[PDB]
Design an enzyme around this catalytic site. Structure first.
Site, PDB file in Angstrom:
ATOM      1  N   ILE C  43     -13.848  -6.394  10.513  1.00  0.00           N
ATOM      2  CA  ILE C  43     -14.744  -5.292  10.836  1.00  0.00           C
ATOM      3  C   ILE C  43     -14.140  -4.477  11.963  1.00  0.00           C
ATOM      4  O   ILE C  43     -13.643  -5.048  12.937  1.00  0.00           O
ATOM      5  CB  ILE C  43     -16.107  -5.808  11.299  1.00  0.00           C
ATOM      6  CG1 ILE C  43     -16.876  -6.404  10.123  1.00  0.00           C
ATOM      7  CG2 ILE C  43     -16.898  -4.686  11.935  1.00  0.00           C
ATOM      8  CD1 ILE C  43     -18.057  -7.233  10.545  1.00  0.00           C
ATOM      9  N   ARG C  44     -14.162  -3.152  11.819  1.00  0.00           N
ATOM     10  CA  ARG C  44     -13.717  -2.253  12.879  1.00  0.00           C
ATOM     11  C   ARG C  44     -14.938  -1.533  13.369  1.00  0.00           C
ATOM     12  O   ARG C  44     -15.794  -1.168  12.576  1.00  0.00           O
ATOM     13  CB  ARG C  44     -12.709  -1.216  12.366  1.00  0.00           C
ATOM     14  CG  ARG C  44     -11.318  -1.753  12.134  1.00  0.00           C
ATOM     15  CD  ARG C  44     -10.526  -0.847  11.198  1.00  0.00           C
ATOM     16  NE  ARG C  44      -9.452  -0.119  11.871  1.00  0.00           N
ATOM     17  CZ  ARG C  44      -8.340   0.310  11.268  1.00  0.00           C
ATOM     18  NH1 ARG C  44      -8.139   0.089   9.968  1.00  0.00           N
ATOM     19  NH2 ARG C  44      -7.421   0.960  11.971  1.00  0.00           N
ATOM     20  N   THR C 142      -1.125   7.512   6.112  1.00  0.00           N
ATOM     21  CA  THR C 142      -2.501   7.301   5.695  1.00  0.00           C
ATOM     22  C   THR C 142      -3.382   8.468   6.128  1.00  0.00           C
ATOM     23  O   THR C 142      -3.024   9.630   5.923  1.00  0.00           O
ATOM     24  CB  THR C 142      -3.038   5.971   6.261  1.00  0.00           C
ATOM     25  OG1 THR C 142      -4.193   5.561   5.518  1.00  0.00           O
ATOM     26  CG2 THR C 142      -3.367   6.106   7.748  1.00  0.00           C
ATOM     27  N   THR C 389      30.911   1.937  -5.672  1.00  0.00           N
ATOM     28  CA  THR C 389      32.187   2.465  -6.169  1.00  0.00           C
ATOM     29  C   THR C 389      33.357   2.417  -5.180  1.00  0.00           C
ATOM     30  O   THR C 389      33.200   2.594  -3.974  1.00  0.00           O
ATOM     31  CB  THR C 389      32.045   3.908  -6.711  1.00  0.00           C
ATOM     32  OG1 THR C 389      31.367   4.726  -5.751  1.00  0.00           O
ATOM     33  CG2 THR C 389      31.247   3.908  -7.982  1.00  0.00           C
ATOM     34  N   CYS C 427      29.772  11.143  -8.697  1.00  0.00           N
ATOM     35  CA  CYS C 427      28.374  11.455  -9.003  1.00  0.00           C
ATOM     36  C   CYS C 427      28.279  11.762 -10.494  1.00  0.00           C
ATOM     37  O   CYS C 427      27.223  12.144 -11.015  1.00  0.00           O
ATOM     38  CB  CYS C 427      27.861  12.631  -8.162  1.00  0.00           C
ATOM     39  SG  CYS C 427      27.772  12.303  -6.369  1.00  0.00           S
TER      40      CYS C 427
END
Lengths: 505, 498, 501
Positions: C43-44, C142, C389, C427
């Protein structure tokens, strides 16, 4: 299809689609209002798609027709012709009437929004089968009853026998009975055929209830606006009656709230205090309800007061709610501009038990000699449904309350001409009269009589006037002697003693 | 570790970190305040860990001056850093629980603002609440509401619970708060004063604290420049005679803030040989009260705005001139509200009312009126007048004495001087009598003189008059005549004891 | 009262009172979540009245205890001691831990919010009895899985056997499996003991459903992040396998979306030569429609001109549809690129990361044995086939069959012992690998596909370098050789030798 005459304007529900409470439909509301009173419905759609309009209108015309009540449409003549609507309401800025009649042909009702007499003149030059009923101005902000009367009066001077009327605009339970009551022709022969409610049923969280209420008000016939007898008295106020009046006000110690100028402040409180009743000079808005709750309370009201219209309204209302008496003393009728404005504004805030003025103010209020003053005093009394006092050498008192009677269509042949009007003279010799009248009416009990009380006050004042003018050495003492004479005069009720002669007019 | 009894609540500095002036620290301020008075410090708080570093850093400072540290309202931060006490509010953790965690030995402060909360504080007995901060006295309920609490602390015999006043306390009202925040039985006053913005936000905290100390450990509130000595000897003819001579010779200026009583009151004043002013103008208010032998007469139901009434009530207290308060109506909601608001704006030299207004003010016959008049006089530390058939005058000033926690040695509502003499004109009269008093005068006698003079001119007028109208003009006359010949041995009204 | 060991961190529901949907209570939500999964509740009470807090906390501790699940409190040690709470969570900026322990005494759980290794070092110098579990950083806005790994790794280097872990911060169904999957210690010995959801159950209009979903994800053990076989192959990629790879990509005509720099034209040619259509769309709206097309494939370069918000958009778009992403980070080149790469590596799950010496050592978080070690580190870290590579190309399979589990976490499979092969004889290699993986069907195998690509490329390299007269032709011959090489699957022919590492 209804014929012009099957139209019941009693409770005319004008819908405003854009103010329905959530979870409620226009159908929902307009239904509730039907099986509870509404006897005419008008649909407005000044805010939607003229095709969705038509689907709502058809859907609601089924509901209405089902309760045998007509449907009217504002102001799309076309939508009306289209969906076989029973009538159409147009305004002053909408399509000219002849033009409308030409399209819809007779058989359909045409409502017009009239607010001034000039518009009744026009409505009449068009004869019948043009306008079938008018909605009278906007009574209240959303011109008042005074302005409505002026219209009903033109509807009569013009003999527009064919044209019905509904009052419209800001009509609620807090003022419907007053509107019904004083919106009558000056010859008593015509009143409002119904009332238009909008925000009061539509916006109602319980439309069934709100409608039951407005019905209760509309088909009642007594506006008991003050808790005092309103019986019509033709027998001159007897000595024994005057005596009982003064006893009552002494025994009852009425609280008279004074809203008046800096000058009548001190003077008026002394007149009141001398009549054995406590004066309060509160121009404070919050107090106004607590103040009028106190027993035998009374409002005395001056124009040229320093208090804001919003508070005068606040008070005028506060006293009408509790059915206590207001005495109105307009000390500035032209004066013609700011005061004229303020007065007219006040006269539409509530119902006054007494209006007091002198020659100028009373002629002004009647909307313009000695027979003339008598005629004007009756006009004022009737107009504002009140006891009206006109001060001068002779004081004239007229009772225009008509026992608090109102009806739709209006007064039982009781015109301006034939209400009780008496005179009070005492030979050659004023806002003190207000305070006096206030205290006399203040003391009256349930079983009392408003008219006699006012006359008593005018006598008592006129009497203390003769006495003071004799016992005094100038303006200064005349005033202090007047207060004295009022004190002495009432401490011994011996009205048989008093100088002023009370005749008929 | 301090024991509950070593706690000196004298000058309780409640810190508010978020209002320190630039270039100054919380350490800086709270240090200055410690060297010059502060005898108790509460820390309020940011990040609950930075909190803990500031709290430890300040607990070293405090302990160093041998003054405890209290914490609001984090019980955990408190237990954690070995704090000496914790202050919680009404909406913070229930007290029994708090006690359970911190165990005895630690001080628990509770924010009380109503008696109902003292009732609860008492059902918990000792060891629970160790001191309360009384309501918020001023906007940031007043002294009146603080009294109601001290009174419950007494009806409940909460001997164990100390009190500090809190909320908007400044030098412009600390002495008045100390002075009239006393129990109704005189047995208890405030144990201390909570300052916040007055030391913390100070650009010179050392000075601001030196000042609040000077006020807290003084014992005389000379709120009006008139003698406040307690007089038990009935006001003698020769004294009354000297009063009237003084007000005639001094031509006092009596500022009227009133409704109707405008014209009448100015005449009563003018008849007593003193000039009346009816200024409800805020800017004038200070210049007005500067004029010699000036005096404020104050009606409720006046048209002037609370902001200006406050402006004036203050203006006169600042210059130590007398205010006479006449609460008319006290008993519409709107007026009740306004009065209570006014009674916390300053210190009145005299409150005047009749049966209703006086019973209302006392917070509810003839012995009853006497009891109520004393209650009011004491409550608002003032000479209170109650008009009727008999007029009662009570002196509740107690010589302007205040003290911490004592509070009135033992002078209760019951035993203050109250005399008898057997209407808003009376206000103006009293105003002129007090107005004329010089440094060496006496406030109580002045008020009685006024009630006599008025009651006297009343008998005379009622005889020489033919009704309401003349009674009034004769009353003004009789006041004029009565004072032009000081022959008080002549006057009709009999002055007894109550 | 629970003992430290009875604590099930599986689905740890952290409540945030100030974001409950109307007509719903905190009790209502936290109840629903308990019946369907939540195995721990915190719980906060940010911002409320520390006394109303206590009434809600007691009211919810009855609910929790009733489902035999502990209650934890943030970050009011006092409210915790007061209401007999089972544990307390504090942050880095909250009360020092030794102090907390002193007040609550042992027996009660202490949660700490750790985001960096340095904080694990501290947590460890305090020994057991102290921190009982940590919530790992804020994974997402968030720092991501990479940063969580760095912590689990310090929890291991420090042997903090006693301290459990839950991941926290922006955890949702769109990324929980990936978090569980790649948040494992580098020695495979430790993963996340649970997941902290906040806005996903609390703010849910149907918390019972949202919770049943997060449970389904948490106690599953397969992250099938790409619709290709992930089976571990230790048998060198056979000629016949390589042959089948190329046939598949030719027959399947994979669509390879290129988000790249220069390599625009070149890459599209390599792709086009491998018989698969390339698209160079850096358009956000298209990204979902694009990945819907059959055998689609994302090739991703850094140093691209497209905005992070769109790279995220795409990386996600392909993971949703379970199609393969090949990541080619083209540079420890410039703070700005380092930043962008790390940001990308937390947007989704890559089927293959390809780089050279510098880029691979950098990605592993730093010779020839060294390159091999680094290639395995990268492969494991980002749970992907990693290609390095050089003269020799090294390919390592760190997918571990898409296996994840709580607290375990990898079935003893560490960085050290994953399949790593060598190919000896840029690439463009990305585009190649992309086409090989792209053609793989349901039944395919990702690892072989990648090796096939490195072979095919290395092979077309030998051929081109022979048939050419300089840089210019070498390039056009390489494209040619790729075309020719795949039109005849004769891998037995090809130059490059595929050994073990």
């Amino acid at each position: 299809k209804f014929s012009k005459e099957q139209f019941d304007y009693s409770l005319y529900l004008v819908t405003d689609s854009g103010m329905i409470p959530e979870g409620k439909t226009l159908y929902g509301q307009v239904e509730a209002g039907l099986q509870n009173g509404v006897t005419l419905v008008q649909i407005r759609e000044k805010d939607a798609d003229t095709k969705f309009f038509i689907e709502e209108a058809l859907q609601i015309k089924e509901l209405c027709h089902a309760h045998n009540v007509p449907l009217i449409i504002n102001d799309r003549i076309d939508v009306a012709m289209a969906i076989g609507a029973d009538g159409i309401h147009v305004g002053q800025d909408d399509m000219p009437i002849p033009m409308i009649r030409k399209l819809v042909g007779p058989d359909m009702v045409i409502g017009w929004s009239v607010g001034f007499p000039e518009e009744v003149d026009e409505l009449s030059k068009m004869g019948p089968d043009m306008v079938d009923y008018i909605g009278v101005g906007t009574l209240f902000p959303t011109m008042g009853t005074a302005g409505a009367i002026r219209v009903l009066d033109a509807l009569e001077r013009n003999n527009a026998h064919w044209c019905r009327t509904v009052g419209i605009g800001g009509l609620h339970p807090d003022n419907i009975e007053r509107v019904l009551y004083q919106c009558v022709s000056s010859n008593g022969k015509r009143s409002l055929d119904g009332i238009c409610v909008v925000s009061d049923i539509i916006a109602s969280l319980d439309a069934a209830k709100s409608t039951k209420i407005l019905r209760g008000l509309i088909d009642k016939t007594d506006y008991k606006f003050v808790n005092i007898g309103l019986s019509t008295k033709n027998s001159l106020t007897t000595t024994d009656e005057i005596q009982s009046i003064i006893s009552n006000t002494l025994k009852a110690r009425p609280l008279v709230q004074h809203i008046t100028n800096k000058v009548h402040q001190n003077f008026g409180a002394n007149v009141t205090l001398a009549l054995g009743s406590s004066p309060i000079m509160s121009e404070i808005q919050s107090e106004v309800n607590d103040l009028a709750a106190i027993p035998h309370a009374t409002l005395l009201l001056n124009t040229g007061s320093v208090a804001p219209p919003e508070m005068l309204k606040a008070a005028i209302r506060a006293y009408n709610d509790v059915k206590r008496p207001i005495v109105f003393d307009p000390v500035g009728y032209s004066a013609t501009e700011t005061r004229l404005l303020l007065n007219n504004k006040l006269l539409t805030f509530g119902q006054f038990s007494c209006i007091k003025g002198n020659s100028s103010e009373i002629l002004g209020l009647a909307e313009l000699s000695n027979e003339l003053l008598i005629q004007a005093t009756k006009i004022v009394a009737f107009k504002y449904k009140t006891v009206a006092v006109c001060t001068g050498e002779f004081d004239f008192i007229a009772d225009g309350t008509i026992e608090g009677k109102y009806s739709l269509s209006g007064t039982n042949g009781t015109s301006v001409e034939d209400i009780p009007c008496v005179a009070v003279e005492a030979g050659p010799i004023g806002c003190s009269l207000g305070s006096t009248i206030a205290c006399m009416i203040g003391g009256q009990p349930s079983e009392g009589n408003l008219f006699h009380a006012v006359v008593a006050g005018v006598m008592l004042y006129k009497a203390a006037g003769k006495i003071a003018s004799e016992k005094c050495n100038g303006s200064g003492s005349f005033q202090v002697e007047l207060i004295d004479a009022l004190y002495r005069l009432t401490r011994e009720n011996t009205p048989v003693t008093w100088a002023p002669k009370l005749t008929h007019t």
